[PDB]
């Protein structure tokens, strides 16, 4: 009963959507670990079709998409600019409003009104007198905040109490004390008085500031005591961001969904590439499987021998099963980027298969050698350096999840990027790139104009910024490892080689699990693990289970008995 507000708000038909010009495949269902429960999010299989008949509509949608990050979620930065070049990760998010029944048109009213969110002002008594009387419809299911209290953060009103009114005693702990008199004993010096003393009051509920719902926030919440501190608010003492509150509360989950889809697209592309490369386009290609999650990974706190299924599906393809996006993305998600799952479980299977395949290849290829050199070469093959060198050229590591997704300081917004001029100076001046510090990035104060209609800083401001950058040479900022704070700005990353060495094996692991050893063997040739001889096709496919013998295992005589 202290959580049904989202439970119904999340279940509102009025939703939002993501708008693209390139199409999408089917995507895996995702879980969300909210601070009040668990959520599941899916992407519609069939997108809607809209043509941009007016460039003004496109510009307004872009402005609203930027405004959401700038104000609603507090993601903006002084250097942030709406991207106009539109090459690197450019797209938009558009809300929906229930149109002609099955149609959910764009909330054109919302974009036309809230180009920018209004500012909660400390309205005084004098102007409150002639201001219009608050209406119950004007506040129901909307967004409000307390301009009088130091808690300036936006908050949400759930239901309106027309029967309640000021001068009403607090039902809990203050039966002798009224809301009205408490207001003066708390903020009377700041409000002056409450006008329209006989009107209704509203019941409000707070909003979380947390933006990463991947991990289960296990703890003794004490939900009954969580909402025990109940708030009833006077309408005229609080601002009103008149807004479909359900859409707002859904918008907090947006960055996590965006990041998970961003990486799941890489997973899907890898699945397509590896399915095609092994000539796998049979019936199990279609559809998708909902993404699973593990429990025994610590931080996710909340007769006759059985036939071995892997061998059975290796020899009998009736038991084969299709790999899915979840497994590949799990093999992509590094431990450092501690999501609900990670790549560590498939790593052991991949390591074992790589060891066995290298051993078999060496034995069936170099049978004229002793054990010492064979073991030495085998350990050289499965060594971390070799795996790193053979996976970098595979061009995979740019599509790896290796850093924790914290949006405010370790993320770049989708539709927002750095100014084009400073980027062009940055990516073409290696002598100057290494000296740029985050203080220099925050030196420029780019207002609405630069981000909206310009995309670049002014020439005088350009000179000021570059002078501030060059002044770092004589200060402590010189010689600092700024890549810790600028790589995510320039779309760069630093990754330990252990991650690459383990993630190659993690990739091999799911392939082994789903299909069988014989099909998995070709992937070593794909990563040029073993320069397989075309003269014997089965050596890279099956002869590893069929070869290895010579004259020293063939002679027949009962004398050996």
Swiss-Prot record:
Q: Mutating residue 205 to E: effect? A: Decreased siRNA length fidelity. Abundance of 21-nucleotide siRNAs produced by the enzyme is decreased whereas the abundance of both 20- and 22-nucleotide siRNAs is increased. However, has no effect on RNA cleavage rates
Q: What is the effect of changing residue 371 to A?
A: No effect on RNAi silencing activity
- Sequence ranges assigned to domain RNase III in this UniProt record: 311-516
Q: Effect of gene disruption?
A: Abolishes RNA-induced silencing complex (RISC) assembly and RNAi silencing activity. Abolishes siRNA unwinding prior to loading onto the RNA-induced silencing complex (RISC). Decreased levels of endo-siRNAs. Increased susceptibility to infection with RNA viruses such as Flock House virus, Drosophila C virus or Sindbis virus. No effect on the processing of pre-miRNAs. RNAi-mediated knockdown inhibits the induction of the antifungal peptide Drs in response to M.luteus challenge. Also highly susceptible to infection with A.fumigatus, with 80% of flies dying six days after infection.
Q: Where is this region: Platform domain?
A: 1-117
Listed result of changing residue 505 to K: Loss of RNAi silencing activity. Decreased processing of dsRNAs into SiRNAs. No effect on mRNA cleavage
Q: Where is this region: RNase III insertion domain a?
A: 402-496
Instruction: Name the domain of life.
Output: Eukaryota
Q: Which residues cross the membrane?
A: none
Can you say where in the cell this protein is located?
Nucleus; Cytoplasm; Cytoplasm, Cytoplasmic ribonucleoprotein granule
Domain PAZ stretches: 137-191
Q: What is the recorded phenotype of mutating residue 218 to A? A: Decreased siRNA length fidelity. Abundance of 21-nucleotide siRNAs produced by the enzyme is decreased whereas the abundance of both 20- and 22-nucleotide siRNAs is increased. However, has no effect on RNA cleavage rates
Q: What is known of its domains?
A: When in complex with loqs isoform PD (loqs-PD), undergoes significant conformational changes during the full ATP-dependent dicing reaction cycle for processing a 50 bp dsRNA with a 3' two-nucleotide overhang and a 5' monophosphate terminus. At the initial dsRNA binding stage, the helicase and DUF283 domains transition from an extended to a closed conformation, this anchors the bound dsRNA through major and minor groove recognition and forms the ATP- and 5'-phosphate binding pockets required for dicing activity. The N-terminal helicase domain, containing the Helicase ATP-binding, Helicase C-terminal and Helicase insertion domains, functions in dsRNA stimulated ATPase activity and RNA translocation during the dicing reaction. Essential for processing endogenous and viral dsRNAs. Binds and hydrolyzes ATP enabling the dicer to translocate along the long dsRNA substrates, and produce siRNAs processively from the end. Some reports suggest the domain is essential for the recognition and initial binding of both blunt (BLT) and 3' overhanging (3'ovr) termini dsRNA substrates.
In the record, the note on similarity to other proteins reads: Belongs to the helicase family. Dicer subfamily.
Relate the assembly described in the record.
Component of the siRNA-directed RISC loading complex (siRLC), composed of at least Dcr-2, r2d2 and Taf11, which processes dsRNAs into duplex siRNAs which they then load onto AGO2 to initiate formation of the RNA-induced silencing complex (siRISC). The Dcr-2-r2d2 complex exists as a heterodimer and heterotetramer, with the latter showing higher siRNA binding activity. Interacts (via N-terminus) with the siRISC loading cofactor r2d2; interaction is essential for formation of the siRLC and consequently, formation of the siRISC. Interacts with Taf11.
Q: What does this protein do?
A: Double-stranded RNA (dsRNA) endoribonuclease which cleaves endogenous (endo), exogenous (exo), and viral dsRNAs to produce short interfering RNAs (siRNAs). The generated siRNAs then mediate gene silencing, also called RNA interference (RNAi), by controlling the elimination of endogenous transcripts from mobile and repetitive DNA elements of the genome as well as exogenous RNA of viral origin. Also acts in an RNAi-independent manner to activate translation through cytoplasmic polyadenylation.
Name of this protein: Endoribonuclease Dcr-2
Lineage, please? Answer: Eukaryota, Metazoa, Ecdysozoa, Arthropoda, Hexapoda
Gene of origin? Dcr-2
Q: Which residues of the full protein are shown?
A: 739 to 1427 of 1722
């Amino acid at each position: 009963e202290y959580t049904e507000h989202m439970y119904l708000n999340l279940q509102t038909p009025r939703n939002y959507a993501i708008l693209l010009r390139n199409k999408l495949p089917r995507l895996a269902e995702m879980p969300l670990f909210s601070n009040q429960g668990k959520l599941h999010v899916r992407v519609a299989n069939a997108p809607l079709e809209v043509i941009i008949q007016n460039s003004e509509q496109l510009e307004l949608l872009h402005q609203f998409h930027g405004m959401v990050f700038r104000d609603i979620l507090k993601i903006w930065h002084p250097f942030f600019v709406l991207d106009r070049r539109s090459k690197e990760n450019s797209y938009l998010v558009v809300p929906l409003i229930l149109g002609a029944g099955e149609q959910k048109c764009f909330d054109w009213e919302l974009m036309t009104n809230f180009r920018r969110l209004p500012q909660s002002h400390g309205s005084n008594v004098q102007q409150r007198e002639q201001q219009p009387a608050p209406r119950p419809e004007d506040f129901e299911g909307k967004i409000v905040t307390q301009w009088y209290a130091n808690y300036d953060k936006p908050m949400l009103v759930t239901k309106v109490h027309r029967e309640l009114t000021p001068l009403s005693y607090m039902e809990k702990n203050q039966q002798d004390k009224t809301y009205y008199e408490f207001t003066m004993s708390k903020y009377g010096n700041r409000i002056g008085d409450v006008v329209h003393k006989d009107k209704f009051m509203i019941e409000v509920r707070d909003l979380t500031e947390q933006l990463t719902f991947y991990v289960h926030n296990r703890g003794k919440f004490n939900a009954k005591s969580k909402a025990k501190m109940k708030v009833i608010l006077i309408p005229e003492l609080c601002f009103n961001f008149n807004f479909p509150g359900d859409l707002w509360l859904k918008l907090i989950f947006l960055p996590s969904i965006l990041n998970r889809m961003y990486f799941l697209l890489h997973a899907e592309a890898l699945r397509k590439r590896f399915n095609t490369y092994l000539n796998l386009h049979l019936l199990p290609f279609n559809g998708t499987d909902y993404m699973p999650r593990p429990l025994e990974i610590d931080y996710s706190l909340k007769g006759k021998v059985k036939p071995l299924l892997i061998l059975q599906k290796t020899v009998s393809k009736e038991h084969i099963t299709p790999a899915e996006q979840g497994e590949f993305l799990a093999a992509i998600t590094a431990s450092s980027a501690a999501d609900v799952f990670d790549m560590e479980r498939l790593e052991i299977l991949g390591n074992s298969f790589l060891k066995l395949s290298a051993t078999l290849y060496l034995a069936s290829k170099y049978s004229d050698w002793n054990e010492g050199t064979l073991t030495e070469v085998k350990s050289k093959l499965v060594s971390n350096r070799n795996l790193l060198f053979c996976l970098i050229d595979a061009d995979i590591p740019k599509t790896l999840n290796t850093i924790q997704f914290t949006p405010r300081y370790t993320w770049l917004p989708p539709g927002i990027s750095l100014p084009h001029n400073v980027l062009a100076l940055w990516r073409e001046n290696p002598e100057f790139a290494k000296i740029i510090g985050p203080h220099n990035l925050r030196d420029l104060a780019l207002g609405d104009e630069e981000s909206l209609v310009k995309g670049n800083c002014s020439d005088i401001n350009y000179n000021r910024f570059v002078e501030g950058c060059r002044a770092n040479g004589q200060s402590f900022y010189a010689g600092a490892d700024f890549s810790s704070e600028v790589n995510f700005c320039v779309g760069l990353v630093t990754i330990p080689n252990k991650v690459i060495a383990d993630t190659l094996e993690a990739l091999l692991g799911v392939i082994v699990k789903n299909y069988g050893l014989q099909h998995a063997f070709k992937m070593l040739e794909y990563f040029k693990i073993c320069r397989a001889d075309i003269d014997k096709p089965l050596t890279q496919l099956l002869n590893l289970e069929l070869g290895g013998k010579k004259m020293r295992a063939n002679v027949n005589t009962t004398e050996i008995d």
